[PDB]
Design a protein around this ligand. Structure first.
Ligand code: ZN
Ligand code: ZN
Lengths: 568, 239, 61, 129, 96, 96, 195, 536
């Protein structure tokens, strides 16, 4: 372990001592864009440092190349660096060309001090042992995994470090085997950065309703792909909401009251900001459980609505103007008429925040709006950089959406979320009708070669959204065995693909012994190994490890070698 | 304002027939219109490929993306925005001509009427497309609209030049359509026999030999001669 | 009308601004070697306000 | 679709100083043995003569671009006056020899000089810019 | 209940067919070939895709529409030039 | 004077000379006795000492009084309003 | 020229807020700068009194200039005490006074609007009364005072005018109209009296 | 003067305190490091550099007028300017001002693009292998720009001197018999009759019964000021008197353009008086190196100049007897390499004089029979803005000397506040050949030539069909400022030296007139010329 849960306050105090000078701005926060959890964590840090008047700079970085370029550009005065959402799975001192002898001051006296401190803050579990164990400059905000599940790796790393006959060589190979089996592991996510920073705030005592709301947003960002993590962290948020809500309950509503509530939040898509029919129709879970992509699915949906006794005219009405008779009986109606179709998991408990008279909104809807703003908010090596520039710019739109004074931007985000879900649904029914997903014995490939609005999928977030749609659809099919999926999308302007190796997941709400063990995404190591040999102009720079940009002509040989690769 | 779309008799223009035969509209009705566009099907392969590739993109959903991208880029205006801008311009600006603009308009109207007169004299028949004082007012209105869209209170000579170009591209183009014969045949034969196939002769010399000499332009159409040195040299192109 | 200039008051005010700027610079140099930065922040913003008042007065004149 | 991978660069009416053979030497297409020597005979050709003729053709191309006659882009009537914004038929003037053609010819000359190692031709190309 | 889409297609083949149709219409022909006859190919391809209840126009459904249009154009020409026109257009109806 | 020194063809020769000398006169005023205060500074009262800004145009790196500012495009700062007023006026930083 | 057009003869509302921010207010400190009997940097300001700042004792009410109270309230290092006139009882009393005397304004402090806005924005959690009611009474006072002003701008003679008890922001917003209509009605009178 | 190295971190506070607060200059990290290096080198302990920084920023704001002073070019430029102002005041330098930093020669390919906005503006316009190819719009506007310049000259001179207005040709249509004054480009219509071309249109002119100003050359392509009565019966303009536009003094054009700083003007004026003894030697035309007699005469001339080398030795065009072209032969004819051999032979007769070829800029001007211009024209008057002699043929000549410039045929010299233009062309022959006759001694003809060139304001007032011109490189021929000194070199005109409208025009003539190797000497300080005939 490097920084446990109980000693986050030590890191915060170290940051304050090193860089809380009003003379200059010696603190720089590197945030990974295209990550809602990192966005909420950086918003928390921004508010916390605004309270203590610690001058700081927030830089959205898209890829590892940008991180390296910025660090090279980074001045030596800046003596505190925060990496939010990345950096925990690579040799940062090696990647950034860091040698501790050039950053050490006042070596003496069993202590050491350095002129610059890098605090990595992410949730991807393959901690690089040369970062968590063998470097003092790099300081990792651990969540308790290393101090409990890395004892063997700690011993193996230290023995090899200190040792630089037959028994000695045999034991070295035995220890080196322990390190090797630690690697060759898929990259998962166990915690949410927002929850970690909220734990730090609880240690410092700066918790309030806005920070709790940011924590809820960051945690709810994990419910789509890491539902086990969200279910693990949910009781803590539930306790915090009860702790922070004022005792003056059942009071009259006033234009100033902000209420965090735990009320039934059905697992539909933008239920409060769109019609009930559109909430069922465009839901990922409902689509998986009913197969609405085919023609018979719409008939099933209409039959369900008739069964509940909700007229289609009322069902398609906007949620605000739905008749108060139906809107107040949603719980009873869903209890009576959902287990018939297997949608019992739709009913759920979530967090809903109302700001005075501005109407309710749930964290699930809020994160969809934020994601939409990230995705569509606003010869070959140059236009791609223009895309990176636009993608960085969208981070600030999603950042400004968090402010309560910019609801006119959150509504635009909601509209963009509805449009993007519509486009995702159209492309999904186009893929599943033409049977574009080629089943294999290693990975179910799927390449998007032509169609409409194909420029949406050059963004990694939109491609992951489509992949999550497909994976949710496949997960509820019993015949289809679990298998990694690959999505690609040709970028005509740059003549390059965007391969996004995904991971399968068990059906939502299905809790078993094998469900408890998380599924690990093995595509990162496979991609890196394939790129190391057989130079193919592959661009592996995303913080999301399992996403690469490959030339149009080099895609097929790359996939051939990947098929020959048994790593994944 | 009346924006009327019509069709010449026989469907196609049929330029073999006289320009007055294709258009069945009277001169009175044709005089009201400020700009009388006569479009034609070029049947050009390089343009046909472009049109086909554009129409296919229109059909295969590519329009809904390309037009939106262009509009958000700032090179286009949505209908709901252009409508408001048009209303604002019409209720805010009513440009009036500058004296330098008026001199250009007068001196251009005289040229246009002189060209129409010489065409009528050559053809010995009143032109189907008329040029009248109402067309001078048409050029004035086009100039004022060009200034209006820029909200300029006074119409400079840039707007006059563009209005003149628009009129020449629409109404003069409509009026310039063309379908003695013995003189043409004699000229073609004598220059074919006298001027060799590979050499060139200067045009002043042909004038000495002698008119309007539309025969040279007709031969240029047939690609047997070619005016190259700024019209001062007539070169037998090889036919 | 253009009101008469208060020469003595403005001379004293400019002297005060100069001396306070020097004091802030000296304190900053001393700090450049507890961690109470509120007094320094208040000094800086107070001097900014005084400079703004004199700026607006002079420019109106 | 198949496009010819090779361009053409012909020195018209090249003369062989021994057998008096008048042939059009092509540099981008012919084999190297077929340009440095004649066809009917087999005597060699001077490098200086080849470079001189290539330079002469390059300057001829430049001069022909500079002294070309403009023509309307809609009615193709050759421009006759010296001060005129556009054709009277509302068509912009355009050259009979487009600039892109001369740019392509210059690139061909540079490629030939760099490949065959024509020093004087490279000096000419550099002197152009 | 069916609205096929023209996503998967070779627009180059349709463009070439349209260009050839216009070139042979202007010279030795009288059937007017406007852009409407370019859109007719797409509409006929969509009808053929409707016949198979397909939601996407396949390459066969486009080649069949091209064959229908070029056949209707050719068969309306004078017998003197019909053989030459059929020979010229044979390269687009390869396969039938 | 804190934004830019600029189409200048809209001015006659006399007016151009007048503006050119007037800038020098203003700089003389800003240096004679009222040098402690920035006479060319903003006339809006300094409400808040600390503001957050967003970099509009990339400017590489610019040295401040004590440390340094790395003006990376689309990166947000949280700095004192005193040392970024000129950059905000010029058009490199945006927020407040 | 040096001074922009919109700053010619009036004060921008930002300048009114700047003027108001120089008035002393009473605060409850959350820190303690009082040096014990048994280093530290003192404020030593030049445009106010630093005595009450170097002697702050936590939860012991002092009086500091408003722009410093706000600066401390930016952190959690003080707690601005609302003035006595900014309570529901006193606001109701002033509203009753306004409704009872339709010819003269109530005796509200000259900075009541600016102070109310500043305290509602920056010190929203330091009021013993629900802020949703203080806002509703401030707005009611503003409405009544606006009705009385519009019925007195009907007395814009050319000699003088007595706007007794009017606030500072209200006067500032009415200045360009009153002081430019009375100028014209004075120019007309002096032109008539040219004999 | 004590050297010291000071790191940017410690200088940063004071640096910003002045550059940013006092005047509003943003200093980058690299620029701060460079300024720290400069301060450490030219002062020790880095304490009393406040005046240095103040001078730096005031010069920067007075001249450069931008932000981000730390560009390694702005800082260096301002430091240098401080150096020259300290030098003229008489630290880093306290020497005397050198004219080399104020002497430059401008090629035709390196001038400033000045296109005149038709209403009233003289704008400034300023990429690959084929980056020098002019665009079509350049050919379109080539004559329009020239007409606009001549029209501005007329609107400044004629109306304030003579006050009939200039009516554009398009305004003559409806008018039946009124009198008009037209400024148009004289040319021949495709129908074969003379006409005037104007931006507004064209009109045929009846040249019979015309009284022209006898002190001018009238040729097609020259812009004239005709006056007559329009007739609508046949659409003709019966001209009565036609004359060239009046010229303008150079100083008049300078205040209109308004191009110089005051310090530069003062320094140039100072070195004008200080550098009294500078001699420019202009050699004769047609230095036929192939000729042995001319080669021997050049040896004597170079020997005579070796005793007192001049400032500039200008060499005129047509360095070889026969035009160079692709020659089909197996001998050493090889018109390319024979040029190389001729220049190598020149190197032998030029490197022999150590006193010469030193402290003497040697400018070479090409002619009608030079490489890269005679390949296509075959020794005729082809494209006018001739490119310099190719560097591939100047290896030995450039190796022998240290300051040799190979420049265009219409080159420009910026020796001082005055401008000198060198032009090698047989203007007299073309003017006499293409002068048009009116149906209605030697010094007089030279005056006619000079007056025509200066009144036209163009180096070659000829049609594009008589002297092809690179479309973008046409400003290099326009005499918009009317340079003070012009070397109107010629081979068909008698040697002369005339002054007109404040411009000194000198024509060295042929190198060998009858038996003497004539050449010219020019003294810029006294503005006096003298010829030096040397017998063979
Ligand atoms: Zn041979
Ligand atoms: Zn035309």
């Amino acid at each position: 372990m490097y920084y446990g849960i109980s000693q986050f306050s030590e890191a915060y105090n170290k940051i304050l001592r090193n860089s809380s000078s009003h003379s200059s701005c010696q603190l720089v926060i590197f945030v990974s864009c295209l990550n809602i959890d990192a966005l909420c964590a950086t918003k928390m840090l921004s508010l916390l440092f605004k309270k203590q008047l610690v001058q700081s700079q927030i830089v959205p970085i898209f890829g590892y190349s940008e991180l390296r370029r910025h660090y090279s550009q980074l001045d030596d005065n800046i003596n505190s660096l925060l990496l939010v959402g990345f950096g925990g799975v690579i040799d940062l001192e090696a990647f950034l060309e860091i040698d501790p002898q050039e950053y050490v001051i006042d070596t003496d006296s069993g202590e050491q001090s350095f002129r610059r401190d890098i605090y990595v803050l992410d949730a991807h579990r393959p901690w690089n042992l040369d970062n968590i164990f063998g470097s003092q400059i790099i300081q990792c905000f651990d969540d308790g995994t290393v101090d409990d599940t890395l004892g063997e790796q700690k011993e193996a790393y230290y023995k090899l470090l200190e040792l630089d006959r037959k028994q000695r060589k045999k034991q070295i190979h035995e220890y080196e085997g322990v390190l090797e089996e630690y690697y060759s592991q898929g990259t998962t996510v166990v915690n949410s950065i927002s929850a970690q920073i909220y734990s730090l705030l609880s240690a410092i005592g700066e918790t309030n309703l806005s920070n709790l709301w940011l924590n809820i947003l960051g945690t709810t960002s994990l419910d789509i792909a890491y539902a086990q993590v969200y279910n693990r962290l949910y009781p803590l948020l539930q306790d915090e909401v009860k702790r922070l809500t004022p005792s003056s309950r059942n009071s009259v509503k006033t234009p100033d009251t902000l209420t965090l509530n735990i009320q039934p939040d059905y697992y539909l898509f933008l239920l409060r900001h769109s019609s009930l029919y559109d909430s069922f129709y465009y839901s990922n879970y409902v689509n998986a459980k009913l197969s609405l992509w085919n023609e018979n699915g719409k008939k099933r949906l209409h039959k369900m609505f008739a069964r509940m006794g909700i007229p289609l005219s009322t069902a398609q009405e906007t949620w605000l103007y739905m008749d108060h008779s139906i809107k107040r009986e949603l719980g009873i109606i869903f209890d009576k008429n959902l287990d018939r179709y297997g949608l019992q998991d739709i009913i759920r408990d979530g967090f809903v925040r109302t700001l005075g008279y501005r109407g309710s909104i749930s964290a699930s809807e809020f994160v969809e709006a934020l994601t939409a703003l990230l995705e569509v908010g606003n010869n070959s090596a140059q236009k791609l950089t223009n895309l990176r520039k636009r993608w960085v710019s969208n981070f600030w739109l999603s950042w400004d959406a968090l402010d309560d004074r910019k609801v006119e931007l959150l509504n635009r985000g909601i509209q963009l979320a509805q449009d993007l879900q519509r486009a995702i649904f159209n492309t999904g029914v186009a893929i599943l009708e033409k049977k574009l997903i080629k089943h294999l014995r290693i990975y179910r490939l799927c390449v998007l070669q032509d169609g409409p609005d194909l420029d949406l999928y050059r963004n990694p977030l939109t491609l992951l959204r489509l992949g999550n749609w497909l994976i949710e659809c496949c997960a509820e099919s019993e015949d289809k065995q679990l298998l990694p999926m690959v999505l690609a999308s040709i970028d005509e302007n740059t003549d390059t693909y965007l391969v996004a190796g995904l991971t399968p997941r068990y059906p939502r709400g299905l809790d078993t012994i094998h469900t408890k063990k998380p599924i690990l995404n093995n595509f990162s190591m496979a991609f890196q190994q394939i790129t190391a040999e057989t130079d193919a102009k592959v661009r592996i720079d995303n913080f999301e490890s399992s996403i690469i940009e490959i030339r149009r002509e080099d895609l097929s040989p790359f996939l051939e070698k990947l098929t020959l690769s048994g790593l994944l | 304002s009346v924006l009327a779309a019509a069709n010449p008799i026989y469907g196609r223009y049929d330029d073999l027939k006289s320009p007055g035969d294709n258009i069945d509209f009277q001169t009175t009705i044709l005089s009201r219109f400020d700009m009388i566009f006569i479009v034609k099907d070029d049947h050009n392969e390089e343009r046909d490929i472009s049109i086909a590739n554009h129409v296919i993109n229109i059909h295969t959903g590519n329009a809904n993306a390309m037009q939106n991208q262009q509009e958000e880029n700032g090179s286009e205006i949505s209908i709901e925005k252009m409508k408001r801008y048009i209303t604002y311009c019409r209720l805010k600006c009513a440009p009036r001509l500058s004296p330098q603009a008026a001199e250009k308009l007068s001196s251009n109207f005289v040229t246009i009427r002189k060209q129409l007169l010489i065409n009528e004299l050559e053809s010995t028949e009143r032109s189907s497309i008329p040029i009248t004082i109402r067309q001078l007012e048409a050029i004035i209105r086009i100039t004022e609209s060009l200034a209006k869209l820029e909200l300029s209170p006074i119409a400079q000579e840039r707007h006059v030049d563009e209005a003149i170009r628009l009129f020449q591209a629409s109404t003069m183009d409509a009026a310039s359509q063309d379908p003695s014969l013995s003189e043409i045949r004699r000229f073609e034969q004598e220059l074919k026999r006298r001027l060799p196939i590979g050499w060139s002769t200067s045009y002043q010399t042909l004038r000495r030999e002698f008119a309007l000499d539309k025969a040279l332009y007709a031969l240029e159409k047939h690609e047997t001669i070619q005016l190259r040195h700024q019209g001062q040299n007539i070169y037998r192109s090889g036919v | 009308e253009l009101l008469p200039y208060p020469h003595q008051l403005m001379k004293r005010l400019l002297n005060r601004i100069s001396m306070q700027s020097q004091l802030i610079e000296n304190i900053s140099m001393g700090f450049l070697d507890n961690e109470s930065k509120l007094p320094l922040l208040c000094m800086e913003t107070e001097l900014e306000r005084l400079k703004f008042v004199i700026r607006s007065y002079i420019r109106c004149r | 679709e198949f496009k010819d991978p090779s361009l053409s660069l012909v020195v018209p009416d090249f003369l062989c100083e021994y057998c008096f053979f008048i042939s059009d030497i092509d540099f981008c297409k012919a084999a190297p043995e077929s340009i440095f020597s004649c066809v009917r005979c087999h005597k060699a050709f001077n490098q200086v003569l080849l470079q001189e003729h290539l330079i002469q053709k390059l300057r001829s191309d430049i001069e022909s671009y500079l002294i070309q006659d403009l023509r309307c882009s809609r009615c193709h009537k050759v421009k006759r006056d010296y001060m005129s914004a556009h054709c009277p038929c509302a068509g912009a003037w355009e050259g009979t020899l487009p600039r892109e053609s001369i740019v392509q010819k210059l690139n061909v000359f540079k490629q030939v000089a760099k490949y065959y190692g024509f020093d004087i031709l490279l000096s000419c190309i550099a002197d152009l810019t | 209940k069916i609205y096929p889409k023209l996503h998967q297609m070779d627009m180059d083949k349709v463009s070439r067919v349209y260009a050839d149709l216009r070139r042979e219409s202007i010279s030795t022909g009288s059937f007017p070939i406007t852009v409407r006859h370019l859109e007719s190919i797409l509409r006929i391809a969509e009808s053929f895709a409707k016949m198979r209840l397909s939601e996407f126009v396949s390459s066969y459904d486009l080649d069949r529409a091209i064959k229908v249009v070029v056949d209707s154009f050719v068969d309306a020409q004078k017998v003197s030039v019909r053989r030459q026109l059929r020979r010229s257009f044979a390269i687009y109806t390869l396969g039938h | 004077n804190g934004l830019d020194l600029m189409d200048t063809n809209n001015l006659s020769h006399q007016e151009q000379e007048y503006l050119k000398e007037y800038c020098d006169l203003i700089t003389d005023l800003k240096s004679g006795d009222l040098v402690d205060i920035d006479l060319s500074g903003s006339l809006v009262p300094p409400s808040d000492v600390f503001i957050d800004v967003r970099v509009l145009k990339d400017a590489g790196e610019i040295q401040t009084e004590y440390g340094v500012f790395n003006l990376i495009k689309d990166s947000q700062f949280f700095v004192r309003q005193s040392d970024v007023e000129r950059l905000i006026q010029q058009g490199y930083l945006q927020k407040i | 020229m040096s001074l922009p057009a919109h700053l010619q003869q009036t004060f921008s509302p930002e300048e009114i807020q700047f003027i108001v921010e120089n008035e002393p207010i009473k605060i409850f400190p959350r820190i303690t700068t009082r040096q014990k009997i048994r280093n530290h940097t003192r404020w030593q300001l030049i445009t106010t009194d630093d005595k009450a700042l170097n002697n702050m004792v936590a939860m012991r009410s002092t009086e500091v200039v408003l722009w410093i109270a706000l600066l401390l309230k930016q952190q959690s290092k003080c707690s601005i005490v609302a003035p006595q006139w900014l309570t529901t009882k006193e606001l109701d009393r002033k509203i009753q006074y306004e409704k009872t005397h339709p010819d003269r304004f109530s005796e509200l402090p000259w900075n009541w609007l600016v102070l109310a806005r500043i305290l509602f924005n920056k010190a929203k959690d330091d009021f013993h009364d629900p802020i949703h009611e203080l806002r509703g009474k401030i707005q009611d006072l503003r409405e009544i005072r606006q009705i009385k002003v519009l019925k007195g701008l009907k007395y814009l003679n050319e000699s003088h005018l007595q706007l007794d008890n009017l606030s500072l922001l209200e006067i500032n917003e009415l200045r360009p109209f009153i002081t430019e209509i009375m100028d014209k009605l004075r120019e007309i009178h002096t032109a008539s009296l040219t004999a | 003067v004590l050297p010291v190295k000071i790191q940017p971190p410690l200088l940063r506070p004071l640096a910003y305190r002045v550059l940013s607060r006092k005047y509003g200059l943003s200093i980058k990290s690299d620029g701060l490091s460079a300024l720290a290096e400069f301060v450490g080198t030219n002062i020790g302990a880095n304490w009393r550099q406040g005046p240095a920084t103040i001078k730096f920023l005031e010069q920067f704001a007075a001249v450069w007028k931008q932000q981000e002073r730390g560009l390694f070019i702005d800082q260096s430029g301002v430091k240098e300017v401080i150096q020259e102002m300290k030098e003229r005041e008489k630290p880093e330098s306290s020497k005397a001002l050198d004219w080399r930093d104020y002497f430059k020669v401008i090629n035709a390919s390196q001038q400033q693009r000045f296109s005149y906005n038709p209403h009233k503006m003289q704008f400034i316009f300023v990429g690959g292998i084929a980056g020098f190819l002019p665009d079509i719009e350049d050919k379109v506007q080539m004559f329009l720009t020239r007409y606009y310049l001549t029209n501005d000259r007329v609107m400044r001179n004629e109306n304030f001197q003579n006050s009939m207005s200039i009516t554009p040709i398009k305004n003559l249509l409806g008018r039946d018999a009124q009198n008009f004054l037209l400024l148009g480009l004289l040319n021949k219509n495709f129908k074969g009759n003379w006409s005037l071309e104007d931006p507004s249109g064209s009109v045929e002119i009846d040249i019979s019964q015309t009284i022209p100003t006898q002190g001018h050359y009238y040729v097609p392509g020259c812009m004239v000021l005709v006056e007559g009565i329009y007739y609508s019966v046949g659409n003709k303009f019966h001209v009565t008197s036609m004359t060239l536009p009046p010229g303008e003094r150079r100083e008049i054009t300078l205040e209109t353009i308004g191009n110089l700083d005051k310090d530069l003007k003062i320094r140039l004026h100072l070195l004008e008086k200080e550098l009294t003894d500078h001699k420019f030697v202009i050699l004769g035309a047609n230095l036929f190196l192939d000729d042995l007699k001319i080669m021997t005469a050049l040896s004597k001339i170079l020997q005579k100049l070796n005793d007192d080398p001049p400032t500039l030795l200008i060499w005129q065009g047509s360095f070889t007897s026969v035009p160079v072209f692709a020659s089909m032969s197996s001998r050493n004819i090889s018109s390319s390499t024979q040029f190389k051999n001729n220049f190598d032979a020149l190197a032998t007769l030029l490197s022999r004089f150590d006193n010469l070829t030193e402290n003497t800029t040697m400018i070479f001007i090409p002619g009608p029979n030079d490489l890269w211009g005679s390949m296509v024209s075959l020794g005729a008057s082809g494209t006018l803005p001739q490119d310099p002699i190719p560097s591939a043929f100047t290896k030995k000549i450039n190796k022998v000397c240290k300051n040799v410039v190979w420049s265009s045929n219409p080159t420009r010299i910026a020796y001082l506040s005055q401008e000198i233009v060198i032009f090698r062309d047989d203007l007299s022959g073309r003017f006499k050949r293409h002068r048009l006759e009116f149906p209605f001694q030697k010094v007089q003809e030279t005056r006619k030539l000079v007056k025509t060139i200066l009144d036209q304001g163009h180096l070659s007032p000829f049609l594009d069909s008589l002297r092809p011109i690179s479309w973008d490189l046409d400003h290099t021929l326009t005499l918009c400022p009317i340079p003070s000194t012009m070397v109107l070199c010629d081979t068909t005109s008698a040697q002369f030296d005339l002054t007109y409208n404040g411009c000194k025009v000198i024509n060295p003539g042929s190198f060998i007139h009858n038996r003497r190797a004539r050449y010219m000497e020019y003294v810029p300080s006294s503005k006096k010329t003298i010829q030096e005939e040397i017998y063979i």
